[PDB]
Design a protein around this motif. Structure first.
Motif, PDB file in Angstrom:
ATOM      1  N   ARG A 200       0.840  -1.119   0.240  1.00  0.00           N
ATOM      2  CA  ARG A 200      -0.059   0.003  -0.081  1.00  0.00           C
ATOM      3  C   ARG A 200       0.914   1.413  -0.023  1.00  0.00           C
ATOM      4  O   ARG A 200       1.731   1.374   0.945  1.00  0.00           O
ATOM      5  CB  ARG A 200      -0.764  -0.016   1.358  1.00  0.00           C
ATOM      6  N   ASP A 261      -5.651  -0.259  -0.502  1.00  0.00           N
ATOM      7  CA  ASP A 261      -6.107  -1.819   0.202  1.00  0.00           C
ATOM      8  C   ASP A 261      -7.377  -2.137  -0.624  1.00  0.00           C
ATOM      9  O   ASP A 261      -8.390  -1.304  -0.638  1.00  0.00           O
ATOM     10  CB  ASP A 261      -6.368  -2.055   1.510  1.00  0.00           C
ATOM     11  N   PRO A 293      -3.227  -5.119  -4.404  1.00  0.00           N
ATOM     12  CA  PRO A 293      -2.719  -4.714  -3.186  1.00  0.00           C
ATOM     13  C   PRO A 293      -2.813  -5.502  -1.912  1.00  0.00           C
ATOM     14  O   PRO A 293      -3.516  -6.244  -1.557  1.00  0.00           O
ATOM     15  CB  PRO A 293      -3.729  -3.503  -2.903  1.00  0.00           C
TER      16      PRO A 293
END
Ligand SMILES: [Cu+2]
Ligand SMILES: [Cu+2]
Ligand SMILES: [Cu+2]
Ligand SMILES: [O]
Ligand SMILES: [O]
Length: 476
Positions: A200, A261, A293
Motif C-alpha cells: 500500500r 487496499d 494490493p
C-alpha cells in the motif's frame, strides 16, 4: 486459474573480479500451455537487470552459446563505439567477448538487446532483451520506492505471434518489412497477464516497450493517474501526472502509481493509431498486468522535485544535420495491401480518415536514410565530440511510424513530429517520434566512435532497421 505472478528479472552486480557474466543461449518457454524454443540471457527468455553505478567501471563477459552470430548493445547507455555492440560488434557462435563499461551518465533505466546486422528483429522476437538499472548518488537521496520486485518493478511489455505448433512465428518478408512484425499475444516480463502483489502506497513501474514494431499506450483500468518520474535517459525535473502514457518501441518511462487496499486494478494498453496495431485483441484496451494490493505499508516517496534539468542552449551556429527517412513506395504499397487483404479494414482502425525483377527491387534494402540503405562499411558522416548538434529527422514522404533512436547519447527533443514535446518527453530521451512529419533533437556525444565500431542511428521499428533504415556515424 489464478494469474501467474509477474516474473522479476534478477538484479545483477559485479563479482570480486568486477565482472558480470552474461550467457546468450536457446532454451524452452511455455505460452498458453505450449512449449516454444526461445532465447535468453542467463536463462531461456529475456534477461537479468544489470545494475551499474555512475563513475564506476564494470567488465561484462558475454558468452554466445547460440549457433549464429549476435551482438549486444546497451540501449540508452553512453559508451564508446568500441563497446556499443552495434552490428560491427560481432560475437562468434560459441565465442566470448568482454567489454568494460565506464558509466558516465545520470541514473536511468536502460536496456540491452542484440544488434545483429539485418537480423535484430528476429533475435529480439526469439527472446533476447535485458535491463540496465543505473544508479547515482542523487537518486538515492529521493527515497523513491526501491525494493526490487516488491515496490520497484520492471515491466517489459512485448507482443509475439506463434504458429499452430507453438513456436514463435517470425518472418522478415514483404508484409512485415512494410508494417513490422506484430502479434496477437501480449507478454509482460515473458508471462501472459500476470499479477503483481504490491504494498500500500506508491508502486514504481519501470516500463519498457520491447515490441519489435507495436507502439503502446499505458493507462490504468480505473483511471487512476500515473506519475511520470523518468524517461529514457533518467529523471524528469519534477513528476508529471498523466492519464495515459504513449510509449514507442525501445522507450522507457518510470512511473509511480498509487496502491490502495482492497482495490486491485490493471495496468492496460489502449488502442493506438498505428497501421495493423488495432487488430483484435488490441482493438480494445488490453490488460498488461493486475496489481494486487497488499495491506502492508510501502515506504517510498513521490517527492515534489526530482532533479535539475539544464536549459536548452542557444541554437544559433550549431551544426544542423538532415536525416531524410524513406520507404520504397512500391514495396510499402505491396506490404500494406497484403495487410489489408489479410485482416481487412480493421488493419487501419483508428487511422486518420509477383515476379522476380532482381536485386534492384529487393525489399531487404528498401528502407533508407538520405537515399541509402544501411551500409556497414560507410559511415554517413563524422559527428563532433563534446559539441551540441541539431539533428533534423524527416519522415515526410510516408505515414509509417519511425521511432528514431541515436546511439551514444541522451538528447533533448526540440520538436517531436512538428510540435514541442510533451512535458514528460522534454527531459532526457534517446528516441523521438517521426511519423509523416519532422522532428529535431539537440544531441551531444561524449565518447569516440571510429569507423570500425560506428554508432548507429535508426528507426527502432526493427523490421525497418533490418531492411535498411539505419546509418552509421563516427564521433572524434
Ligand atoms: Cu541504442
Ligand atoms: Cu535499441
Ligand atoms: Cu540500436
Ligand atoms: O539501440
Ligand atoms: O537498437
Amino acid at each position: 486459474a489464478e494469474r501467474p505472478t509477474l516474473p522479476i528479472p534478477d538484479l545483477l552486480t559485479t563479482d570480486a573480479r568486477n565482472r558480470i557474466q552474461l550467457t546468450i543461449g536457446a532454451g524452452q518457454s511455455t505460452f498458453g500451455g505450449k512449449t516454444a524454443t526461445t532465447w535468453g540471457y542467463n536463462g531461456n527468455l529475456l534477461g537479468p537487470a544489470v545494475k551499474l553505478q555512475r563513475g564506476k567501471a564494470v567488465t561484462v563477459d558475454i558468452y554466445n552459446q547460440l549457433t549464429e552470430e549476435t551482438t549486444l548493445h546497451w540501449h540508452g547507455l553512453e559508451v564508446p563505439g568500441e563497446v556499443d555492440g552495434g552490428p560491427q560488434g560481432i560475437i562468434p557462435p560459441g565465442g566470448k567477448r568482454s567489454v568494460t563499461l565506464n558509466v558516465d551518465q545520470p541514473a536511468a533505466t536502460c536496456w540491452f538487446h542484440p544488434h545483429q546486422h539485418g537480423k535484430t528483429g528476429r533475435q529480439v522476437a526469439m527472446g533476447l532483451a535485458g535491463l540496465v538499472v543505473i544508479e547515482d548518488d542523487e537518486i538515492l537521496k529521493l527515497m523513491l520506492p526501491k525494493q526490487w520486485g516488491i515496490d520497484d518493478v520492471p515491466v517489459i511489455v512485448q507482443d509475439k505471434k506463434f504458429s499452430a505448433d507453438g513456436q514463435i512465428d517470425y518472418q522478415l518478408d514483404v508484409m512485415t518489412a512494410a508494417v513490422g512484425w506484430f502479434g496477437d499475444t501480449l507478454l509482460t516480463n515473458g508471462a501472459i497477464y500476470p499479477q503483481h502483489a504490491a504494498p500500500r502506497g506508491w508502486l514504481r513501474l519501470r516500463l519498457l516497450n520491447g515490441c519489435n514494431a507495436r507502439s503502446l499506450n499505458f493507462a490504468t483500468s480505473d483511471n487512476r493517474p500515473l506519475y511520470v518520474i523518468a524517461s529514457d535517459g533518467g529523471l524528469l525535473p519534477e513528476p508529471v501526472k498523466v492519464s495515459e502514457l504513449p510509449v514507442l518501441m525501445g522507450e522507457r518511462f518510470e512511473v509511480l502509481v498509487e496502491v490502495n487496499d482492497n482495490k486491485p486494478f490493471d495496468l492496460v494498453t489502449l488502442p493506438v493509431s498505428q497501421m495493423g496495431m488495432a487488430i483484435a485483441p488490441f482493438d480494445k484496451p488490453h490488460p498488461v498486468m493486475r496489481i494486487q494490493p497488499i495491506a502492508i505499508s510501502a515506504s517510498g516517496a513521490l517527492p515534489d522535485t526530482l532533479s535539475s534539468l539544464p536549459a536548452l542552449p542557444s541554437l544559433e551556429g550549431l551544426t544542423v544535420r538532415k536525416l531524410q527517412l524513406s520507404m520504397d513506395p512500391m514495396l510499402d504499397m505491396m506490404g500494406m495491401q497484403m495487410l489489408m487483404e489479410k485482416y481487412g479494414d480493421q488493419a487501419m482502425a483508428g487511422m486518420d480518415h509477383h515476379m522476380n525483377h532482381g536485386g534492384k527491387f529487393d525489399f531487404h534494402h528498401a528502407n533508407k536514410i538520405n537515399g541509402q540503405a544501411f551500409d556497414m562499411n560507410k559511415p554517413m558522416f563524422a559527428a563532433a565530440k563534446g559539441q551540441y548538434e541539431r539533428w533534423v529527422i524527416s519522415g515526410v514522404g510516408d505515414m509509417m511510424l519511425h521511432p528514431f533512436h541515436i546511439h551514444g547519447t541522451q538528447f533533448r527533443i526540440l520538436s517531436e513530429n512538428g510540435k514541442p514535446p510533451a512535458a514528460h518527453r522534454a527531459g532526457w530521451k534517446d528516441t523521438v517520434k517521426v511519423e509523416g512529419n519532422v522532428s529535431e533533437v539537440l544531441v551531444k556525444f561524449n565518447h569516440d566512435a571510429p569507423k570500425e565500431h560506428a554508432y548507429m542511428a535508426h528507426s527502432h521499428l526493427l523490421e525497418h532497421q533490418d531492411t535498411g533504415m539505419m546509418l552509421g556515424f563516427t564521433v572524434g
